[PDB]
Motif scaffolding. Structure first.
Motif, PDB file in Angstrom:
ATOM      1  N   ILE A 273      16.785  67.721  39.198  1.00  0.00           N
ATOM      2  CA  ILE A 273      15.495  67.520  38.537  1.00  0.00           C
ATOM      3  C   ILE A 273      14.347  67.651  39.562  1.00  0.00           C
ATOM      4  O   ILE A 273      13.381  68.347  39.301  1.00  0.00           O
ATOM      5  CB  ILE A 273      15.427  66.090  37.883  1.00  0.00           C
ATOM      6  CG1 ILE A 273      16.472  65.950  36.762  1.00  0.00           C
ATOM      7  CG2 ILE A 273      14.003  65.824  37.333  1.00  0.00           C
ATOM      8  CD1 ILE A 273      16.347  66.977  35.636  1.00  0.00           C
ATOM      9  N   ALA A 274      14.491  66.989  40.712  1.00  0.00           N
ATOM     10  CA  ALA A 274      13.433  67.021  41.723  1.00  0.00           C
ATOM     11  C   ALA A 274      13.231  68.422  42.271  1.00  0.00           C
ATOM     12  O   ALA A 274      12.101  68.834  42.515  1.00  0.00           O
ATOM     13  CB  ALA A 274      13.742  66.034  42.875  1.00  0.00           C
ATOM     14  N   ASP A 275      14.328  69.140  42.476  1.00  0.00           N
ATOM     15  CA  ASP A 275      14.201  70.509  42.990  1.00  0.00           C
ATOM     16  C   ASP A 275      13.539  71.433  41.961  1.00  0.00           C
ATOM     17  O   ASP A 275      12.674  72.241  42.341  1.00  0.00           O
ATOM     18  CB  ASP A 275      15.566  71.063  43.493  1.00  0.00           C
ATOM     19  CG  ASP A 275      16.024  70.369  44.801  1.00  0.00           C
ATOM     20  OD1 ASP A 275      15.174  69.886  45.576  1.00  0.00           O
ATOM     21  OD2 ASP A 275      17.237  70.311  45.061  1.00  0.00           O
TER      22      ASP A 275
ATOM     23  N   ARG B 106      10.677  71.268  27.942  1.00  0.00           N
ATOM     24  CA  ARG B 106       9.667  71.216  26.876  1.00  0.00           C
ATOM     25  C   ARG B 106       8.258  71.240  27.430  1.00  0.00           C
ATOM     26  O   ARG B 106       7.376  71.891  26.860  1.00  0.00           O
ATOM     27  CB  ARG B 106       9.869  69.981  25.985  1.00  0.00           C
ATOM     28  CG  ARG B 106      11.178  70.021  25.208  1.00  0.00           C
ATOM     29  CD  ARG B 106      11.354  68.795  24.340  1.00  0.00           C
ATOM     30  NE  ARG B 106      12.629  68.844  23.619  1.00  0.00           N
ATOM     31  CZ  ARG B 106      13.241  67.793  23.077  1.00  0.00           C
ATOM     32  NH1 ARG B 106      12.704  66.576  23.161  1.00  0.00           N
ATOM     33  NH2 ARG B 106      14.401  67.960  22.450  1.00  0.00           N
ATOM     34  N   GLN B 107       8.028  70.538  28.535  1.00  0.00           N
ATOM     35  CA  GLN B 107       6.683  70.502  29.102  1.00  0.00           C
ATOM     36  C   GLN B 107       6.244  71.832  29.703  1.00  0.00           C
ATOM     37  O   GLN B 107       5.070  72.239  29.594  1.00  0.00           O
ATOM     38  CB  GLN B 107       6.581  69.398  30.174  1.00  0.00           C
ATOM     39  CG  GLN B 107       6.523  67.962  29.611  1.00  0.00           C
ATOM     40  CD  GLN B 107       6.403  66.958  30.734  1.00  0.00           C
ATOM     41  OE1 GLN B 107       6.719  67.247  31.879  1.00  0.00           O
ATOM     42  NE2 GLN B 107       5.981  65.746  30.399  1.00  0.00           N
TER      43      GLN B 107
ATOM     44  N   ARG C 257      18.864  76.570  36.776  1.00  0.00           N
ATOM     45  CA  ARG C 257      17.586  75.965  37.121  1.00  0.00           C
ATOM     46  C   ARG C 257      17.736  74.529  37.578  1.00  0.00           C
ATOM     47  O   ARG C 257      16.898  74.042  38.342  1.00  0.00           O
ATOM     48  CB  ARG C 257      16.636  75.940  35.925  1.00  0.00           C
ATOM     49  CG  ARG C 257      16.220  77.319  35.451  1.00  0.00           C
ATOM     50  CD  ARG C 257      15.463  77.208  34.154  1.00  0.00           C
ATOM     51  NE  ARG C 257      16.284  76.651  33.087  1.00  0.00           N
ATOM     52  CZ  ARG C 257      15.846  76.435  31.855  1.00  0.00           C
ATOM     53  NH1 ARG C 257      14.578  76.734  31.545  1.00  0.00           N
ATOM     54  NH2 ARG C 257      16.658  75.937  30.931  1.00  0.00           N
ATOM     55  N   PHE C 258      18.803  73.876  37.122  1.00  0.00           N
ATOM     56  CA  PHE C 258      18.972  72.456  37.412  1.00  0.00           C
ATOM     57  C   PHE C 258      20.090  72.000  38.318  1.00  0.00           C
ATOM     58  O   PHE C 258      20.330  70.819  38.449  1.00  0.00           O
ATOM     59  CB  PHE C 258      19.052  71.693  36.082  1.00  0.00           C
ATOM     60  CG  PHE C 258      17.776  71.748  35.290  1.00  0.00           C
ATOM     61  CD1 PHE C 258      17.601  72.668  34.263  1.00  0.00           C
ATOM     62  CD2 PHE C 258      16.703  70.923  35.641  1.00  0.00           C
ATOM     63  CE1 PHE C 258      16.366  72.775  33.594  1.00  0.00           C
ATOM     64  CE2 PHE C 258      15.462  71.018  34.978  1.00  0.00           C
ATOM     65  CZ  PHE C 258      15.299  71.944  33.962  1.00  0.00           C
TER      66      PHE C 258
ATOM     67  N   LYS D 111      18.005  63.727  29.971  1.00  0.00           N
ATOM     68  CA  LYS D 111      16.712  63.421  29.358  1.00  0.00           C
ATOM     69  C   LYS D 111      15.559  64.006  30.151  1.00  0.00           C
ATOM     70  O   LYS D 111      14.574  64.514  29.579  1.00  0.00           O
ATOM     71  CB  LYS D 111      16.549  61.910  29.254  1.00  0.00           C
ATOM     72  CG  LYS D 111      15.239  61.468  28.618  1.00  0.00           C
ATOM     73  CD  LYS D 111      15.286  60.086  27.996  1.00  0.00           C
ATOM     74  CE  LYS D 111      14.271  59.979  26.838  1.00  0.00           C
ATOM     75  NZ  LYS D 111      14.286  58.646  26.151  1.00  0.00           N
ATOM     76  N   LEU D 112      15.685  63.939  31.475  1.00  0.00           N
ATOM     77  CA  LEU D 112      14.651  64.488  32.328  1.00  0.00           C
ATOM     78  C   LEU D 112      14.573  66.030  32.209  1.00  0.00           C
ATOM     79  O   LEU D 112      13.515  66.605  32.201  1.00  0.00           O
ATOM     80  CB  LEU D 112      14.930  64.093  33.790  1.00  0.00           C
ATOM     81  CG  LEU D 112      14.846  62.582  34.049  1.00  0.00           C
ATOM     82  CD1 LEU D 112      15.501  62.220  35.393  1.00  0.00           C
ATOM     83  CD2 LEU D 112      13.382  62.147  34.022  1.00  0.00           C
ATOM     84  N   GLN D 113      15.741  66.668  32.134  1.00  0.00           N
ATOM     85  CA  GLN D 113      15.762  68.126  31.974  1.00  0.00           C
ATOM     86  C   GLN D 113      15.081  68.521  30.644  1.00  0.00           C
ATOM     87  O   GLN D 113      14.283  69.459  30.592  1.00  0.00           O
ATOM     88  CB  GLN D 113      17.231  68.568  31.974  1.00  0.00           C
ATOM     89  CG  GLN D 113      17.489  69.986  31.599  1.00  0.00           C
ATOM     90  CD  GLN D 113      18.987  70.266  31.668  1.00  0.00           C
ATOM     91  OE1 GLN D 113      19.799  69.491  31.163  1.00  0.00           O
ATOM     92  NE2 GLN D 113      19.354  71.365  32.313  1.00  0.00           N
ATOM     93  N   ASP D 114      15.386  67.774  29.579  1.00  0.00           N
ATOM     94  CA  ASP D 114      14.793  68.076  28.276  1.00  0.00           C
ATOM     95  C   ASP D 114      13.280  67.981  28.371  1.00  0.00           C
ATOM     96  O   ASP D 114      12.541  68.838  27.863  1.00  0.00           O
ATOM     97  CB  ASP D 114      15.327  67.113  27.218  1.00  0.00           C
ATOM     98  CG  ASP D 114      14.617  67.246  25.894  1.00  0.00           C
ATOM     99  OD1 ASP D 114      13.818  66.345  25.551  1.00  0.00           O
ATOM    100  OD2 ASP D 114      14.860  68.257  25.203  1.00  0.00           O
TER     101      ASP D 114
END
Lengths: 43, 47, 50, 51, 43, 44
Positions: free
Chosen positions: B24-26, C32-33, F10-11, C25-28
């Protein structure tokens, strides 16, 4: 008073999800505000 | 969705899989740097 | 500014403590953002470049 | 006792804060620990009956 | 001062990895100790 | 062994959540505790 991370710790140890949600929201607010200022100026 | 073929550590007793907060941070760093560049560029032309 | 924290909740069992959004949840949220931001910026760029 | 915390480290970027083991590191730990514990119990059962 | 979690929050909001490692460590120390004591009572 | 579950480039590589870890730990701890208790009951 945890040990300080080394570059090798990344991906094995990661930040708190609450911290990441705070940073994600801060970035979104900065970008939406900047986009609205540009829109106000252009039209 | 994690499967035996696309996820070599998959152990279903542990539930559904998700990116880690480092992932997420990357992603956030790449996205923030990219978009901020595009914005600064427009702000330099218009301001 | 102090680093921001958001969307935590306290679990009643002290051993579990504060719960935070998962990577799913963070990826979603990020996916979206990103959509309207990227599209809005391309729109502005297209106006400025016209 | 107070809830235990382990294996955190403080990141150099003040915004990232304390880093903690991911679910993959925690799963690996548990998968590796469960095997010998369960085996020890199976062996103890054999010892008790041969005792 | 976060709001209390609801049953519905589980799986969407989760505990700190540092906390879980602490709990996993504690369980392993308990089981390791108990297995050693059982071995000592048998031989 | 920590980069073999990349479900979205991407993740990064994916992992179970700490809720999954906690639920597994609860079942494991209670299961093994009962087994140890049965042995401890016989010997102690």
């Amino acid at each position: 008073g945890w040990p300080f991370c080394s570059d090798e710790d990344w991906n094995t140890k990661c930040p708190s999800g609450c911290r990441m949600k705070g940073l994600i929201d801060e970035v979104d607010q900065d970008f939406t505000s900047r986009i609205n200022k540009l829109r106000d100026s252009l039209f | 969705v994690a499967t035996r073929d696309n996820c070599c550590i998959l152990d279903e007793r542990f539930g559904s899989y998700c990116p880690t907060t480092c992932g997420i941070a990357d992603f956030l760093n790449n996205y923030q740097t990219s978009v901020d560049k595009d914005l600064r560029t427009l702000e330099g032309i218009l301001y | 500014r102090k680093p921001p924290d958001a969307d935590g909740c306290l679990h009643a069992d002290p051993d579990l403590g504060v719960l935070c959004p998962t990577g799913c949840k963070l990826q979603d949220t990020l996916v979206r953002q990103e959509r309207p931001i990227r599209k809005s910026i391309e729109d502005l760029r297209n106006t400025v470049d016209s």
